[PDB]
Amino acid sequence: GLSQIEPDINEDPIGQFETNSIEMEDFKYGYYDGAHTYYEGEVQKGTFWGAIADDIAAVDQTNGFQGLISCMFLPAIALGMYFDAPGEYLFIGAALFTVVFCIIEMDKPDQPHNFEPQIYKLERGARDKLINDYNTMSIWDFNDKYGDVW
Amino acid sequence: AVMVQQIEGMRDIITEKHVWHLSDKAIKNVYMFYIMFTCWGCLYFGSAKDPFYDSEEYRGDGGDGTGYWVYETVCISPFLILLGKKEKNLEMH
Amino acid sequence: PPAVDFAFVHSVLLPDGTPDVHWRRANGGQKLRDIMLDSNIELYGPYSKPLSNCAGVGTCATCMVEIVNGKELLNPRTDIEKEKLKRKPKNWRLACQTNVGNPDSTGLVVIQQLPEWKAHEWNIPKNI
Amino acid sequence: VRRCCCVISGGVYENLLFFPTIQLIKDRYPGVQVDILTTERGKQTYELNKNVRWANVYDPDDHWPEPAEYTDMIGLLKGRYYDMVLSTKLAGLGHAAFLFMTTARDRVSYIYPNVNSAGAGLMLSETFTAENTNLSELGYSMYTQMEDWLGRPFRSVPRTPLLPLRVSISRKVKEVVAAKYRNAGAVTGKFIVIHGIESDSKASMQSKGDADSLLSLEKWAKIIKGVRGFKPVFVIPHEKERENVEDFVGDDTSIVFITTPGQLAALINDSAGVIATNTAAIQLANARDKPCIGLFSSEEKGKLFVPYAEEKSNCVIIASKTGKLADIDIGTVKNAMQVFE
Numbered sequence: 217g218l219s220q221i222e223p224d225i226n227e228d229p230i231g232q233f234e235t236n237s238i239e240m241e242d243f244k245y246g247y248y249d250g251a252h253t254y255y256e257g258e259v260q261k262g263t264f265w266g267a268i269a270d271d272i273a274a275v276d277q278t279n280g281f282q283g284l285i286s287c288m289f290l291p292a293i294a295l296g297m298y299f300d301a302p303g304e305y306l307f308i309g310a311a312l313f314t315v316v317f318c319i320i321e322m323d324k325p326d327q328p329h330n331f332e333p334q335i336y337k338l339e340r341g342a343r344d345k346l347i348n349d350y351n352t353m354s355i356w357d358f359n360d361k362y363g364d365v366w
Numbered sequence: 367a368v369m370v371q372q373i374e375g376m377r378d379i380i381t382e383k384h385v386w387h388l389s390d391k392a393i394k395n396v397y398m399f400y401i402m403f404t405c406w407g408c409l410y411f412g413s414a415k416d417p418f419y420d421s422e423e424y425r426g427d428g429g430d431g432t433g434y435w436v437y438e439t440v441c442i443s444p445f446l447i448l449l450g451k452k453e454k455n456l457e458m459h
Numbered sequence: 460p461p462a463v464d465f466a467f468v469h470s471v472l473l474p475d476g477t478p479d480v481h482w483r484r485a486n487g488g489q490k491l492r493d494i495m496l497d498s499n500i501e502l503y504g505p506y507s508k509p510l511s512n513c514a515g516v517g518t519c520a521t522c523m524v525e526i527v528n529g530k531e532l533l534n535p536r537t538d539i540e541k542e543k544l545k546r547k548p549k550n551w552r553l554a555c556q557t558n559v560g561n562p563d564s565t566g567l568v569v570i571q572q573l574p575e576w577k578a579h580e581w582n583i584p585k586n587i
Numbered sequence: 588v589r590r591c592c593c594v595i596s597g598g599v600y601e602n603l604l605f606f607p608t609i610q611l612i613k614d615r616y617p618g619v620q621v622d623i624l625t626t627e628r629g630k631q632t633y634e635l636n637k638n639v640r641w642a643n644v645y646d647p648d649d650h651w652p653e654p655a656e657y658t659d660m661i662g663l664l665k666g667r668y669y670d671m672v673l674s675t676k677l678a679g680l681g682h683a684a685f686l687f688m689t690t691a692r693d694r695v696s697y698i699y700p701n702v703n704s705a706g707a708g709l710m711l712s713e714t715f716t717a718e719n720t721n722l723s724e725l726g727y728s729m730y731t732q733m734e735d736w737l738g739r740p741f742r743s744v745p746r747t748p749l750l751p752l753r754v755s756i757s758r759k760v761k762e763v764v765a766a767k768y769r770n771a772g773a774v775t776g777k778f779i780v781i782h783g784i785e786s787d788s789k790a791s792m793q794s795k796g797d798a799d800s801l802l803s804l805e806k807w808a809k810i811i812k813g814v815r816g817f818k819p820v821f822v823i824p825h826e827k828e829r830e831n832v833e834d835f836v837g838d839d840t841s842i843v844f845i846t847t848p849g850q851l852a853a854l855i856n857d858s859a860g861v862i863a864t865n866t867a868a869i870q871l872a873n874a875r876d877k878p879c880i881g882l883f884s885s886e887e888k889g890k891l892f893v894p895y896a897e898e899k900s901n902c903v904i905i906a907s908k909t910g911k912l913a914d915i916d917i918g919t920v921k922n923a924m925q926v927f928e
């Protein structure tokens with residue numbers, strides 16, 4: 217991880233083969249392995265649709281249109297057979313879907329996890345590539361700490 | 367399809383032998399559908415909130431996406447603290 | 460005659476709430492299991508049935524006995540007691556692997572039998 | 588020179604006593620990006636230099652490394668484009684070829700006295716034949732040939748020492764060792780380190796030439812009972828000794844687990860006293876002008892590992908009359924009461 221100080225060398229290189237787990241002397245069965253946890257009563261509702269759509273909404277960067285086309289793409293190729301047999305229409309439409317998705321994925325948000333590691337200093341919200349076309353900010357030289365606070 | 371086979375030891379056998387195959391075109395079509403599914407997933411899940419490579423855990427410390435960023439970081443931050451230590455000794459500890 | 464003075468505090472306290480000391484006389488040092496069995500005191504506990512223990516060799520950790528005031532006349536831990544029990548308070552020895560010495564021996568070893576299934580801790584004075 | 592490697596060896600102690608040499612190098616030339624190709628347990632010491640750059644881990648005293656690792660480090664020293672090497676690995680041929688394979692303008696190394704240095708002069712700029720084959724047995728200096736070559740009189744004075752062993756601690760190691768001894772029963776001002784415990788561990792920072800350097804615990808119990816308590820914090824090299832120390836000197840005594848020499852120096856800088864035996868703790872105490880006493884197994888090793896005891900006026904060196912580290916445990920207490928307050 218970080219290890220700002222140098223870590224302590226382990227005087228016990230446990231073994232080339234055996235795992236790094238604790239022994240059975242110190243193993244509290246049931247609670248560690250989950251063999252006697254999960255007392256029903258602390259559980260929650262959301263029966264299989266209030267937790268699927270919750271998980272879809274948990275991990276999604278899709279807007280109204282991009283996303284709707286994602287939901288209707290694979291049903292379109294699934295009905296490319298068993299309803300008709302177009303042929304090259306399927307591939308042309310799939311390429312069109314890919315290209316329009318990539319054009320849409322030039323998102324107005326830039327989400328600073330996209331940028332280089334050297335950018336993470338502080339105050340990176342004042343950096344706005346989101347609106348400023350032709351940024352013209354020579355900070356990607358990465359050999360000296362310029363003050364970009366203006 | 368139906369065949370009766372006599373065997374001395376145990377019993378008779380009523381083999382059926384439905385010789386079939388997916389066919390040359392349907393194999394191409396399942397290749398097609400799986401490649402299209404790969405396209406759909408590569409785009410959609412590529413446009414998903416990748417929770418690990420977004421936070422200050424990965425992107426904070428280093429987080430370039432390499433495999434040497436850990437080792438070059440823990441080889442540089444010793445150098446950065448040594449340089450800051452020389453700067454501290456430059457101004458009387 | 461050379462008599463070693465055992466005590467053999469039982470693990471279960473009496474209904475009074477006080478421990479019971481039995482003071483077995485058995486002579487000499489051969490093996491604490493054979494002493495506690497020849498002199499008929501509870502060593503094993505629920506493992507006292509025939510095949511429920513290894514019966515002297517040391518392959519089970521069943522005849523373990525907490526021994527205090529016993530740094531005087533014992534054999535050291537024979538690396539079976541040091542291995543078959545590994546994380547114990549170090550006053551606990553296996554009776555059939557330990558040995559209280561030779562025939563010409565006198566001493567006041569007090570050996571709390573059945574340290575498992577006990578309520579007391581014995582508060583041994585810190586060594587050195 | 589502009590970039591300078593260092594292929595040193597020995598562990599914690601021998602990597603520590605090389606800090607005068609590296610400060611000498613950085614004093615000789617204006618700007619030297621110094622690098623160290625040392626063993627593990629040696630890189631940790633290179634938190635305390637403020638004069639080094641990389642400090643990689645090689646263990647050059649392996650003699651039989653993985654060819655992948657060997658070629659990796661050869662190409663690394665090549666691609667860093669050094670101008671000096673200054674091994675003090677104490678080997679001639681074989682290792683001389685390892686220094687020659689590095690594109691270095693001035694290959695400098697130590698040399699075995701035996702026949703093992705059959706052809707080291709064919710590859711090295713300097714020879715530096717040595718003594719005892721166990722150079723840490725030579726004592727504290729260990730580098731007088733390397734020093735009296737480095738910055739020889741060509742234009743100016745050598746100035747081979749610069750207030751010897753100016754180690755330096757960072758603020759993060761200071762904070763974490765402060766939290767360590769505050770989790771112990773110690774206060775930042777009034778406490779005393781120990782760093783002598785019978786163990787079987789390389790974290791005690793002993794030496795490569797000293798075997799009877801670490802003192803027992805019952806004798807240490809008698810030593811520490813002879814002295815009134817200025818809260819002596821115990822510096823164990825491994826946690827297995829903790830339950831041993833509490834079994835010997837008592838549960839009330841506070842023990843601090845330090846294996847990193849940087850953390851050890853951060854403990855020294857906050858301590859107001861040192862009762863170390865012949866470990867790196869003595870030299871880390873002589874650094875930053877801290878009061879030590881410095882037990883030893885003989886006056887010979889005491890003079891060899893502490894020659895400058897008459898210059899700090901606090902490290903009242905102690906030894907044993909006979910060998911095997913069986914000291915008096917009486918007068919050491921007296922001058923400990925003298926110097927610690």
Ligand code: FES
Binds near residue numbers: 514515517522553555
């Ligand atoms: S009876 Fe099996 S250990 Fe003593």
